[PDB]
Amino acid sequence: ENAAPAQAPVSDRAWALFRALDGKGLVPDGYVEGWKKTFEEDFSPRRGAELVARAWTDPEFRQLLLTDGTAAVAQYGYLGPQGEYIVAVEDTPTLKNVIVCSLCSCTAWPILGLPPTWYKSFEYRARVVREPRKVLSEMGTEIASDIEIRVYDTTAETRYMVLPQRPAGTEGWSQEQLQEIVTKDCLIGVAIPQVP
Amino acid sequence: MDGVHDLAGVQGFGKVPHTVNADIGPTFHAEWEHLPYSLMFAGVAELGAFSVDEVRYVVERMEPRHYMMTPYYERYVIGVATLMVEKGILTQDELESLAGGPFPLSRPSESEGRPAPVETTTFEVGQRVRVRDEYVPGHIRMPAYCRGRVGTISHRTTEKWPFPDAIGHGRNDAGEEPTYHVKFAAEELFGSDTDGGSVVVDLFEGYLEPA
Numbered sequence: 001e002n003a004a005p006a007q008a009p010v011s012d013r014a015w016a017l018f019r020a021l022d023g024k025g026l027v028p029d030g031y032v033e034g035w036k037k038t039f040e041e042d043f044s045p046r047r048g049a050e051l052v053a054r055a056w057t058d059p060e061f062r063q064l065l066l067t068d069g070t071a072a073v074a075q076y077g078y079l080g081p082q083g084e085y086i087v088a089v090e091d092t093p094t095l096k097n098v099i100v101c102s103l104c105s106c107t108a109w110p111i112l113g114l115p116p117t118w119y120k121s122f123e124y125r126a127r128v129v130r131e132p133r134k135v136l137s138e139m140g141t142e143i144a145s146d147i148e149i150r151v152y153d154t155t156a157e158t159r160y161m162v163l164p165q166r167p168a169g170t171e172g173w174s175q176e177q178l179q180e181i182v183t184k185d186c187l188i189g190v191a192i193p194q195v196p
Numbered sequence: 197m198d199g200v201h202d203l204a205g206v207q208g209f210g211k212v213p214h215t216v217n218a219d220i221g222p223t224f225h226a227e228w229e230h231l232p233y234s235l236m237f238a239g240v241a242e243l244g245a246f247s248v249d250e251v252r253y254v255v256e257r258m259e260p261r262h263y264m265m266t267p268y269y270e271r272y273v274i275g276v277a278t279l280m281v282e283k284g285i286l287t288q289d290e291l292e293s294l295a296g297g298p299f300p301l302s303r304p305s306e307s308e309g310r311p312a313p314v315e316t317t318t319f320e321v322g323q324r325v326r327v328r329d330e331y332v333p334g335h336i337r338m339p340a341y342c343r344g345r346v347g348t349i350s351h352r353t354t355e356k357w358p359f360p361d362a363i364g365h366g367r368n369d370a371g372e373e374p375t376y377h378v379k380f381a382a383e384e385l386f387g388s389d390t391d392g393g394s395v396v397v398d399l400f401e402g403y404l405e406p407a
């Protein structure tokens with residue numbers, strides 16, 4: 001009762017699916033290898049960090065990013081699969097934004113990178129919509145009492161990034177220096193950028 | 197579909213397995229893990245055999261206990277394989293032969309889907325809307341926590357997309373609709389039993405009605 005079905009090892013099943021399709025000529029030469037390279041090397045939170053650092057230092061770009069995220073991201077050439085319609089959401093002294101996909105794992109891949117295991121976890125998918133303050137606290141982020149938490153559930157085609165607040169102690173930093181402190185978790189919204 | 201995948205608001209789970217900025221390791225933790233997404237795109241972009249919405253739905257169609265004990269990337273291996281069998285591209289026999297053992301698939305669909313609604317309203321930023329109190333057995337991009345609930349429009353998309361409840365079943369009548377960022381107060385969704393402020397859900401026009 002309630003037992004798992006018998007299954008071949010997952011690696012054997014995954015490669016079986018590949019071999020079945022490839023053996024029928026349905027997978028172009030170098031196709032999955034090309035995607036692997038895109039997923040590993042091109043889709044990266046370093047891109048989102050670059051956008052945040054630009055927005056922090058360029059008021060004009062900040063306005064563009066917050067009004068037409070797609071156009072702003074396109075200027076850098078960072079539109080892509082699972083990142084074709086972008087909305088950036090602005091943290092403020094009274095508002096903290098956090099992103100989830102409660103129904104599966106929807107993530108702005110090209111600018112955040114593929115989602116981490118924890119983001120796809122049942123724990124995150126179930127809990128952050130209902131108790132984001134506790135979830136963030138457990139993860140190491142204390143949200144001050146005078147700050148509204150707003151959770152964006154990625155349920156359609158909009159793909160989100162958080163524009164976090166710029167921390168004190170970074171005045172005059174270069175874009176490269178600022179990029180370094182905007183991590184993947186800052187873009188998802190579970191972390192606040194940290195100054196050494 | 198009111199399946200176990202509709203996890204938002206479920207109580208009883210423990211801690212999220214992460215502390216902020218902790219090392220998450222490489223993108224892929226095993227040598228097969230890039231295959232589900234790559235082969236999904238082969239199916240969608242190269243073969244034109246199915247939509248991304250159909251991939252979401254086939255994963256929703258995993259037997260519930262099977263879904264709950266299966267790691268993320270493996271669910272997509274199962275889902276893509278299921279679609280290839282359902283579309284007549286592969287057989288389960290050949291998958292199992294190549295795998296060297298059992299390769300159970302998602303369960304067959306119990307709904308033919310539904311068309312894009314004929315009657316909808318164009319909403320504006322600031323307008324109060326209610327999520328239609330409707331029950332859809334096939335694919336739908338409305339998490340149950342917002343069904344019948346009232347919120348305010350914060351964005352109407354400048355692009356339009358096929359209605360998931362149709363294209364998720366491979367139907368010809370998905371049309372195109374914009375979506376709306378609908379902001380709900382936490383208490384509208386979970387009463388006193390929430391520590392949050394607001395939740396914004398990105399909802400197709402066909403899921404909404406004036407408040």
Ligand SMILES: [Fe+3]
Nearest residue numbers: 101104105106
């Ligand atoms: Fe998702």
Ligand SMILES: [Mg+2]
Nearest residue numbers: 081082084357
């Ligand atoms: Mg497209």
Ligand SMILES: [Mg+2]
Nearest residue numbers: 166170171172
């Ligand atoms: Mg300043």
Ligand SMILES: [Mg+2]
Nearest residue numbers: 172173174177
């Ligand atoms: Mg300097």
Ligand SMILES: [Mg+2]
Nearest residue numbers: 198199202340
């Ligand atoms: Mg439910």
Ligand SMILES: [Mg+2]
Nearest residue numbers: 010265266267
């Ligand atoms: Mg297992």
